[PDB]
Each structure stands twice: as C-alpha cells, then as structure tokens.
C-alpha cells in the first residue's frame, strides 16, 4: 500500500512537549509526508518510562514509516529503549535507529547515532547519553556490509560546517564524509539546510519551539512550518 | 482510518442474525467488519455461501473474513467469496492471504482448524497442521512495516486464562505481534496476550457480536436477539 | 551483501533428474547469475517427500535468491509444500512462490501459480495439480494491494500468443495483460521468448532435456545452454 | 577462500587463558578451517582493556574471518568494545557481532547476542553483561531487514531443549525458532551438538578446559579436539 | 552482473551534445552492455562546471560500470575533475580513469590517459589538455604494480598503425606495445577496429555525430549503431 | 582486486582433451579457487600451434593466476612456447613457468621444469622434451638469488618416494630436498599426496582421466573431483 | 636480493641543502635502513629543473627502495615530475608517490599526496603546489581497489592531532581516519611521533636542520639522528 | 663494494691468448666485475674448448657475466661447460635467458645469440632467436622491477649514432626495460645514450679491444692487449 519515500516530515528536541507533538502528528496527513524522522531530546532528563510510553503512543497515530534517535538527556538508555521496543512491536513502521538501521521504500538505508557524540572521553548512558567518536564510528561501520543503498543518517550532534555551525563536530563531519549519506538530519533550532560534500544536511527545526520541516528528498527542497 | 470494528464469529447459517448484524453497522459507527467462521454448517452448499455473502455485502464497509472448521470443501467457500468480491471490492476473504484497511493495517488470517500436527484436510473439513499456518504467515515478513490484524478460528494458549488454547497459534501471535487478533468463540471478551490484543467477538449463532475500539483496546458488547 | 537482480538463471520441468539439477546449480557461479527461477515439474508424479527433500538440498547449494512453482505432476500438493517449507526455514533466500509472493532486489515482485491452469473444471491437488482459471486469477488479485512494483511471474501453463502458442491459455494471457508483469517464465522445451503486450514471456527450456537459459532482464535478451 | 564457508573452527570461554588461545590459533591452519567463531567469556571480569588487546592480538594471528560475542564476565562492556573496535581497524576480517552482524562467504549472515540473556530484570553492562530477553529479541529483529540469507547465530546463553538441556533458556529457544538460523553456537563445556527444530545447535567446547571443535556445516557434524 | 565483462557500450567526443547522450544512455539497457566506456571531448572548451555536472547526471542514469577520460578541450582540468569526483561520490560505478585506474568484473584493469598526448612540448591543463609523451608513459608505468590483469586502455589520441593510420602517434603505439592491453578505445569518427600487435584497437565512433559501438570482448568484433 | 592464494585448482596431462579442460576451467568459480596449476602433457605430440592456441583460449577464460609447464610430448618446444607467449601478452595472469618463475600473492615464488627430467643423456626439444638432471638443477639455481620466499614447483617428472612412486626420479627428489619447496605438483594418475621432508608433494590427478584436485595450501590437504 | 622492509630512514624539507642530502644518503648503510621516505620541500621555490636533477642524482646513490612527495614550494609541478621521471627510468627502486603508489616488500602499499593540502580553494601547481582537500581525497580513493594491504602514507601537510598539533589539518586527519594506514609520515621540525587511531603518525625531522629518523616499522618506535 | 667499474669485451672467437691477457688486466685496472659477450668460440669449437675458455675466465675471481654469440652452437655444449665452471666458481654466471645480481644491487640479464626480427629459433646449427623469444625472456624481469638493470646482448640495437643497421626489436627491448647499462658486441670501443639507457660497445677482443666502464660517470676507458 505504501509507496517510495519522497517527502519526510521532521523535527527535533520536543523535550516532553506532548501537545506540540500531537499537533506535529496531526499535520502529517495533509502535508503529504511519506515518513517522519525525529531527533531527540524526546524528553528532559527527569522523565521516566511512562513519559516515553505516552510520547510514543502519541507518535504512533501517524501510521507512517517513522525513525528516531534519542538525545543527550534521554537517559538512562534502557527506559527509552524499552518503550521504543514496546511500541515498535505492534507498530513496526516505527523504528528507533540508534546504533542500528532500517530500510524505507526507495530504497533508502536509514541509520543513526543519538545522544551527544563527544570527541573523546568515556561513554555514558545513565546520567546522560554520551558517546565518544570511536563508538559512533563503530556503529556505522556495520553499514559497509550493505551494498549500493543511498543513506539517511539521524544525529543529534551537529557536523562542523562553515555555513551551518563552525562549532560543530569534526568527528561527525568525518562520519558524513566517509559514508556520503544522501541526507543527514540533526538537532537544531531554526530550520536551516546546507550541502556538506555530496550530503544534504538539514536542521529540521526544534519542536519545543514549534518548528518542523517537510523535506523533498528528490528535489532536496525544504518546506518549513510551525505548530504555535 | 479504521478505528471501530463490528465483529462476530460462527454464524453457522443463521441468515436472519446476519441481516440484523449487518443492519447494525450504521448505528454502531463501524468503520469495518470482521467475521470468522463457521460461516456455514458443514452440510451447506455453494448456493448457501452466495446468499450469505449477498447479505454481508449490504453493509458496504471494508469487510474481512476467514472460514471455520466445517466450511468445507474449501473450494465452495472460495468460489463464492471470489464471486461476491468481483462485485464488492470492499469484501475480502483473508484466509491464507491479506489485504489492507484504512490506516493502513495489514489484515491477514488462517481459518479452519489449526491443529498441532497431522495431515491437512480441505474437503471433509478445514484442518491445517501448525506448519502450514506458519508457512502462510511468513509471507507477511515481506510487508513487515504495517501494524497487523489477524483473523483465526482457533484460539491461542493463554496461561491462567485459557489453558485449552493452542500453543502453536500463540507462537504465531508472539512471532508477528499483531496489534489485534480476532478468534472464534461464544461470549464476548478480550485479553492482552503479550503485546497483542486478542478478542473473542462473540458467537453470532447465539446473537452475540462486539464493536471493537482499536484505539482504546476496548469493546461494546451487543446481541441481535 | 547481495546486489540488484539483472541475470536470472532459469529452466523448467527437471522431472526428478538430480544429476541435471546439480549441474544446473553449478553453473550459477560461472555465469554470475543473480538469481534462479525454476518451473516444474520438479518431480515425476510418482515422487514422494524424500525425493523432494533431495531435490531442494541440491538446489540450496546455490546460495542465491531462488523462486519456484510446481507442475501438474507435483502432487499431492502437501508433499511439495512441506519439503519447500523445510528447506526454506534455514535457506530463506529460497521461495516457493506458488499462490504467494516475495521481493527480489531491484525491486521485483515475484509471484506465481504453478500446476495446470485449466479453463474451468474442478480444482485438484491430490492426483495432480490443476486449477480452474478463476482460482489462478483469485491468487494474483492480492498483488493489486502492492503499489508500483515491476512484477515477475512464474507459471507452468503457457499463455495464448500468436508467436509462442496459438493454443496457449487465453485466461493466462489475460492475467499477463492485466498485471503487465515485466517478465513471465513458463514451462516448455526449447528456449524461446516473445513480447506479450508489455511483458517479456520466456520459455527457459526443459532441464529434463538438459536445457536452461540465462536471462538478461534489462535487455530482454536470453543466452541459451545445455548441461550436456 | 572457498566460495562457501564450510569448516568453522570454534570454541568458547577461554577465560583469560592466553596460552590456550595461542595454541588454538596455532593449529587453525592445519584444520583447514574457513572461519572461526568464538564465544565468551574472553576474559575474567577483573581483566582490563590491555588484557583484551593482548587477547585480540593473538586471535588476529589466525588470519581468518573471525566472529565473536562477549560472555557474562566481559564487563564493563566498553573495554571489550573498545579493543574489538581497535583490532578490527587493523584486521577487517575480525568481527565482534554482539548486537550487530557481518557476512561470511556463502553468503551467510552471522549475528549474535553475547552476555547472559536473562528472562527479565534489568540490563547490566558494568558489573557484568546481562540482558533480559526483550533486549536480545530487539537486537535480532533488525535481521528481518536482511531476511534472504541463511543465518549463523552466536550466543553465550544456551536455549531450552526438551530432553537435553532442561535448564536452558526458553527465550533463547524462542529466538531460534523465530529466526531459524542454520547454525547456532553457544557456550559450554564438552563438545556436542543437537538439532533444535531446523537449527543445528553446537556447544563447541570450553577452551579454558583446552576444548575446541571443527564444524562441518555441510554434514552438520563436528570433529573434536583439545590443545592440551 | 555477469562475472566477466563481455559487452561494452562505447563512444567518444559527444562534445556537449546532451541530447545524443540521453539517447545513448536510454539505449544502453537494450544493448545488454555489461559496461560503458566514453572518451572525450565530453564538452567544448567553452563549457564550464555546471555543464559537466549535467553531463555526468545524464551518464549516471545508465546504472552501469562506466569509465571515461577527457579530451583536448575538457579544460581547465580541475572542472572536469571536480565534477567527476562529485558524481562518483554518489554513483560509485562511475569512474574517471584519467591518469588512474579501476577494475571491471573479470577482473579487468581499466586505465587511461585523456587529453592530447603530444610527441613533446610542455604540459597544458588550462587552455587545453595536452600531455607530452613522457608524462603519459609515467602515468601508465604505475600499472606494472598490477601486473596480473588483462588491461583495457582509454586514450583520446590514436596510435600509429602502419598502413591504416600513419598520422597516428608512435608514442601511443609504443605504450600499447609495452603494456599489451587486451582492448584499446580511442577517439575518432567512423566505427572501426584493427589488431595492433596483440591489442584490439577500437574507434567506437563519434557521438556528436550520433555514432556508438557495442563491443564483444570475447569475439573481438563490434556492433555499430547511431542515435540518429 | 586479487587476494592471497590459499586454494589451488590443479591437474595434469590433459592430452588435448578440450572438453575436459573447459569443464575444469568452469570449476574454478564454483570452488573459489585462487589459482590454477596445470602440468603437461597439455597436448599429444601430434598437436601443432593452432591446437595450443585453442587450449590457451579456453584456459584464459578462468581469469585467475595460472601456472603451467609442458610435458614430454609438448614438442617441438617452440610451438608450446609461442602460443603461451601469445595468450600471456594480453592475459598476463597466465604463465608458463618452464625454466622460469613468477610470484603469486602470499607471497609464493612459482617455478618449474617441464618435460621429462632424465637422470642423464642429451637434451631434446624437437622429437620430445627431455632434459638431463643437471639442466633442471641449472634452471632452479637461479632462484637462490631470490630471498625468503616460500616456493611452489611444477614438474612433470615424479620424484622417487616410497609412498608415491618407488620408481620415481632420485634427482628430482634431490632438487626438492635442496630447494625445500613448500608445494611440489607433479603429473600422474590418481590424486594423492605425501610429504618429502618439509615439502608437500601432490599428484593432482590426470585430466585425461577426468581427475583434478583443489589443494588447501595452509592445511596441506586436498579435495578430490572428476569432471565426468 | 632485497628483503622485507622493516627499517625506514626518513626525513623532510631538505630545501635544496644538497650537502646535507649527501650526508643523509651516506648514512643509509650505517643505519641498516631497508628503505627511505622523504617529504618535501625537496627544493625552495626558486630552484629549477637542473636543481632537481642534481638532487635526484645524489638520492639515487642510496640504492634502496625510496619514496617521496613534493612540498608546497616544489613548483611548477612539471619540473619536479620530469626530473623524477628521468631518474626513475633507470633507478626503478626510486618512486615519487604523489598521487599514485608503489609496493614495498612486506607487502606495504606506499602512497602519497604532496604539496599543501588546504581545506578548500582552487588547485595550484605553478606558483606553488596547493590542493584542496577534495583533491587529496580523490587521489587516495583509488587505493580501495587494492585489497588487504597495510598502507604507508606520505603527506607534507600534518593532520589535526591534540598531541603533535592542534593547528593540523582536520581533512588530512580524515584521510588517515578513513584509510587507517599503518604509518603516516609528515613534514615537520623535531623528530616526534604519536598514534592517531590505529595509525602511527611520524614527524621524522627537518633535513635542512640536519634532522632524520630511522623507523622500526614493527615496533612502531624510532631512533633520532642529525647529520651536522 | 658496490659495482662501479666493469671490464668488458666481446667476440674473442676462441682467442684464448687474448682472453688470458684480458683477464690479467683486471687487477691493475681496479675492475669490480667483468662482462663478456660472444662469440666465445667459433662454431667448430666443441665442449673441451669451452672448458678451456671458462678456466681462464674463472681466474679473474670477480663477479663475471656472459652470454653466447650466434656461433656458440649447439647451445647445450656452451650451457654444460658454463654449468660446470659455475658449480666451482660462484662469481661466474651465464646470464643468457636468465639473471643474477651484482653488488649494488644491479639486476644483470641477457639474451645472447642472434636476435632476428622473425623466423624460427635455432640452437643447433647456430644460435638464433626471433624477437618474440628475446622479449619473452626479458618479461620475467617485471617480477623484479625495482632494480637498476645491466643488459648483455650480442645483437646491437638500432640507433642513428652507433648503428643504422641495428635491430629495432632490440632497441624496443631497451626502451621497454630502461636498463641502466647495455653491453653489445661489435668492433671499435664506443658508446651513446639510447633514451635513458647507456649503450656500450666494449670492443672485439679478437682484435685485442676491451673497455673499462665507469658506471657512475657513464664513461669509457679503452685499451688493447695486442
Ligand atoms: Ca530519565
Ligand atoms: Ca548498548
Ligand atoms: Ca459444505
Ligand atoms: Ca507424488
Ligand atoms: Ca490451498
Ligand atoms: Ca578464493
Ligand atoms: Ca573487566
Ligand atoms: Ca551477478
Ligand atoms: Ca571549459
Ligand atoms: Ca595533475
Ligand atoms: Ca607437436
Ligand atoms: Ca621552482
Ligand atoms: Ca660448436
Ligand atoms: Ca632453451
């Protein structure tokens, strides 16, 4: 019944605003979105399992291929992982892609690495989600086994880039330059979008500010909007 | 998007209850109809299935159904289902196959008796060893990104609530994680089996039917008698 | 690891000839074939389950996407089905597509209806496999729910075609003209092929006679061979 | 290398016995192995990163496609992961498959879930590696994206097996029945194997006891050995 | 794909004619080509970057392993090179082989030296692409590191061939005699081919004039065509 | 593109049987062989230049490192030599190693002395190929200049060995004892092998009788087959 | 004669100091070096062809495998190249690896990108040698075609590295990160070394300051020295 | 020490008297090695004749390379006596169709006999090899490509300077392999540059001629024993 994914409704850092999320999900149908991509933080650090449960219940109404990645504050990891697992059981079109992958009709190989991707230091998943660069790279190296697929990466950490963020991660930029994904979604306020090498890097907007975007994969065109 | 499902099982030839069942659809707010066999008693003939399907078609709503253990030989149920479906696109037998409902929802089923082992039977009755039921549903793995709705005649095993149920059917549910599972049986009820919502819509030959609220995983019970 | 399918190694009616089948499989690596399509009769009517089990074991050594449908003599239906189910549990790249379907990388929607597709009459699955045309059509009806996929069909029964067989089945030709599959493979001795509407209809050859063909899907061209 | 992996040299639980590891690697050439599968614990809980580096350095000397998963004592998880990442940069045919996958000649999809797979409870990766069943099921569900490959699974926890291992895990048995891997390797002492449904389940032996096995994937039989 | 490349769709000097190029590409699938070889000029000297981008975009739709070298007019070198690099990040099967190499299924070592190969003089890459013979020889000597592969060379400049093209370059003939490539593709109008010693030297045709050839590597015979 | 040599497809004395040679060549992709080693007689004495050309054309289809030496009947020497020279110009992965050498990835220093190595007498290259031991030794002494390479020798003449052939040559045995090659391939019927000091001596089989072997270099083990 | 490369004599920036070059060369035998690697600038910008001729003549007296790359000042590029081409004709052990590669006994795949590697900008090779990062990256990608080789990279531009330089190039670091070379040699004063990922990055010293290093490839350690 | 000075000559044609003088000049000449091109003996010469030749040459006790001339047939007699002297003196080496290394290292290889444009090979009535055979011999050197090479041929390459009637095929072998030095047979000591290769005609010893080459400077020092 579903067709190739061209339009992708997306946003980031909802930080627990379930009302805005409901509106976001509510818009989906009339925009013609083929799928949804959401970047954390889904919740503030203090949230607990039941909060994610509600968060995912709301998101499940979309009934569209949906992919997400957690944010630096979505800790401990297992609460997000458990509620993600629970909703995905009967809503298989939904998919947490943190450290893993999935295929969208196209075909498109979707994969991601959420949380804070730090230059170095030790990994953390309880007081926060922090991953040193070598860990992020190890997660994506699995993709080299899959052949001839255009990629879509979801990250929270922004790649270094002069016309997007010169404070961004060189390590994330390295990940993008290595895999050459067709699209890279990252967390950020103010819908923006630049080309980084052959990769279209989009900051869909921050939903905790009511922002979101609808991307045209084929034309690499970006249509923005707000929920307020 | 399908939310309310008017549902029932085991009509067993009672065409009067069927019409009353159908006549309900509008008042219930039903978005769709699901029906599990036995559609007809074993002795039934093709002409019987034709009349059955004609009344069902009057609902003019997305309708899905699987045969029961005595809807044999299989070909008679199939041909008449083929005939009514040529005319009403919203009508659909999902035994060993599938279709889509507004949402979308992947609706699929395996009717007849799903027995633990033994040989398959489709003439004297409809019986399928567990390996055949599993072989049919494995095709759904080609369409893994859709919430599913299963229609079975045979109930699954459920510890502390239904020790008579089939462990094999339970395994198919645990494996595919359907959002909703409809099974044949007398007396409206439902329980959560793992992450799947298993409902017994009621037995129509007893005037029983249910109206499910797929969103709240709840149901309104009713009777045509 | 697998790439898109462009070259299909195909044949028909091996009729239990295990030596031929084996040699046929052994050709895959030398040719670069990306997939195998085999039409029945796989075994003579007299064959039993342990015969099918031996057939599938040899076929499983290909380690290639493989599709098949049975012939009029592959009865009773349950023995062929049980043994296909057995080998397919651990070699999921293999698939009996009789009455069902599967996707190959391309993508291609592979579906089939084996056995003898008769004009009318009664279905038979025990003394032989025979299905009235309305059944075969009923089986393929499910595919209409699947959107925009180029299709590949396997039938044992030849469709009516002024060039391939003026005595072929008119009903089968109707399924073809209706679904407009990209490719249609059918049982028959002597490799040959023609266009039926916008569908490439191919008779890969009869392995019992040692015949096979390597199909260049994009070109609608065929290379012929014989295992001797 | 052979076209299809057939002979696999395997063992489990070396528990820091590096002399035994060196002898295991030393004899690999003589066995004609096409690949190596090793199940943890690779090291005792008290071992540190430098210990894993030594372990991997010795293992990499076999110069063969090698897959491994950690045991319940290989904690914290990041030390094993880090040293696995490191050696894999230098020897790309070496591969930790814990929570992920790789392909072996065939092609075979090799995947695993190391650590202790417990019925329920909380996940642990610092004092030990313990994953309740819902987490192991979540890791493997990603394989449905790559459903057309015969599979080889690596687990530390053994599945429940009526008559053979009444103490085994029902959840691990369920994962095997769900995914139908062709070969399942598990940790344990005393080389042995049995069929669990369609799956060939092998306990290759405990290296800290000097044991190892050379599997014949074709015949589904094994040749036992000891380095002592 | 076939395991060994046998049919090569080839042409030269399209000179910016995007229309003929589109027909060349649209026509490829029907030829049953295993690969495509294109010799410049790809564009007239006046064309700029954007022109090379459009050229590559169209060529990339053939979805076949494709090798190419620039002509005397594809200057300045860096625009052709930059656009070649950009499109190859997206379509790995595309490869500029000017001064470098790549492998085609076989394996065949594909290499070339585009531009005008002059007997002497100074090298030029801005006003035009001209390379004195010592440079071409220098580029190709790297191939002695990859000694065990049959070679396919791409040159704009034609070699001297006693009695057929006595205006041809003796230096280029010397390169061919030294490396013994199995196949040599060169620019020129009017499809033709001859054996220069053991090497099959082919002038596939000038596309600005709608000409192209489909080579049969095995028979060392070619099929001619025109996009007229 | 080529990896280290581990498996070698081998055979001897095909005696002009092109159908067998072709089946032999087609075995390579299915077995995964990394190289091919072939011992004469390639052709019966009666054969002339054009026959060797057909033989080499068929062998050239393998596209794999290949080494061969002539047998006592491959005379006059210059016919075998010219045709080897011809095919090796454009398929440089093939190599007649008679009185010379080549390197395979591993590395392995491959060399040979074909023809009949007689204890004494006069050399002959026209009515037959026969060389007295001192000539064979003189050819092999050139290798001492090449340092630290495991050696692979190809001879037609079998060495004296109580296990392999009690009537074999003591001189050849002596050359093997002096050079200490890793592998020695010799002509003979009935696949078999033995150790001669630290050297693995293999009789790969007689292709005229349809026999061949796939040697596993690392294991000094052979797998047997026949092309019937 | 030559054996596997283990000890490398290296230095950088001789800047035309021929006397120091002679001393550097005269030291080779005393150091027991197996090879020499030299990074530019070979000459200051003012130098001309006859100057490179004198330089290469002195370097050739080493009689050892030797690799080099030009510096930012070795312009115009064609003079350096031409004199490299000249000396390399009869001294093939010598090799300018700028944009290409060679193999050293080991084996080690030796490659380089000399000159100034800048983040972006236009390529320059006449007034100076300057290459934007996308060019450096494009040169090295050809290497992915060569399998399982440990790599040795020669660069003039230093990679960003919290230890040896925070002003280093992030792009050069990216190249090292993607290829994981075994050894990376870079220009710089003061002999020093650090590990970057799995790569040993060495600053061998500045020859114009009398500095040089003797690397021990296997131990990843080096001895320092000065010629004045 | 690394080979720098090479004492060379060609075509002694059985003149053992001249050969002995040639050999005895080696010491005061400071030669590091010796290279000798055929014909070593007239065609009528037999095995014991070659044995005498090699005995005198072996007295030099310096790395020595040689190839045979068109008249050194049948090939087997030259070969056997070369094998015999070489078993005893490791520095002696026939490089016809093969190779050896001199201190440097330098890869020394050669193809003696007459290198003819085409035709059939001959090794009994005389030594003649069509160009394709010479080329097939030398291609083995691509397996040892990182060494500077020293080539020995009896046949001279084509060159406007040295010889207008020279072989274009031999010239092509030189252009392909880029040998550092190439010694060929001929009368009158001389040398020219063929591309980057230094081609040297050391002289015809049956006329007393010989040369002492300085490889590093690419210069000749001529001399005569008569
Ligand atoms: Ca929390
Ligand atoms: Ca984790
Ligand atoms: Ca009935
Ligand atoms: Ca039967
Ligand atoms: Ca059926
Ligand atoms: Ca292989
Ligand atoms: Ca620990
Ligand atoms: Ca293929
Ligand atoms: Ca231009
Ligand atoms: Ca350039
Ligand atoms: Ca003959
Ligand atoms: Ca300058
Ligand atoms: Ca004589
Ligand atoms: Ca000879």
Automatic annotation (TrEMBL), chains A, C, D, E, F, G:
InterPro entries: Metallo-depent_PP-like, MPP_Tt1561, TT1561-like. The keyword Calcium applies. Ca(2+) 1 binds at residues 1, 32, 34. Residues 1-227 form the Metallophosphoesterase TT1561-like domain. It comes from the Bacteria. One of its GO terms (molecular function) is metal ion binding. Keywords: Calcium, Metal-binding. Ca(2+) 2 binds at residues 45, 47, 75, 79. SUPFAM superfamilies: Metallo-dependent phosphatases. Ca(2+) 3 binds at residues 99, 125. This is TT1561 protein.
UniProtKB/TrEMBL annotation, chain B:
It comes from the Bacteria. Ca(2+) 3 binds at residues 96, 122. GO terms for molecular function: metal ion binding. Residues 1-224 form the Metallophosphoesterase TT1561-like domain. InterPro entries: Metallo-depent_PP-like, MPP_Tt1561, TT1561-like. Keywords: Calcium, Metal-binding. Ca(2+) 2 binds at residues 42, 44, 72, 76. Ca(2+) 1 binds at residues 29, 31. This is TT1561 protein. It comes from Thermus thermophilus.
């Amino acid at each position: 019944m579903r067709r190739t994914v061209r339009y992708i409704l997306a946003t980031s850092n909802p930080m627990g605003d379930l009302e805005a999320l409901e509106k976001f999900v509510k818009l989906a149908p009339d925009t013609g979105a083929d799928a949804i991509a959401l970047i954390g933080n889904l919740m503030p650090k203090a949230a607990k399992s039941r909060d994610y449960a509600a968060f995912f219940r709301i998101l499940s109404e979309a009934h569209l291929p949906t992919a997400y990645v957690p944010g630096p504050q979505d800790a401990p990891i297992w609460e997000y992982l458990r509620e993600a697992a629970n909703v995905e059981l009967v809503h298989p079109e939904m998919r947490n892609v943190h450290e893993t992958f999935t295929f969208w009709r196209g075909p498109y190989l979707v994969a991601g690495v959420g949380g804070e991707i730090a230059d170095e230091g030790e990994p953390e998943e309880h007081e926060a989600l922090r991953y040193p660069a070598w860990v992020a790279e190890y997660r994506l190296k699995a993709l080299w086994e899959l052949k001839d697929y255009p990629k879509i990466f979801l990250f929270h950490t922004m790649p270094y880039h002069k016309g997007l963020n010169e404070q961004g991660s060189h390590e994330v930029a390295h990940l993008i330059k290595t895999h050459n994904p067709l699209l890279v979604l990252v967390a950020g306020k103010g819908q923006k979008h630049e080309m980084l090498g052959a990769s279209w890097v989009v900051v869909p907007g921050d939903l905790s500010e009511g922002e979101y975007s609808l991307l045209d994969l084929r034309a690499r065109k970006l249509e923005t909007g707000n929920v307020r």
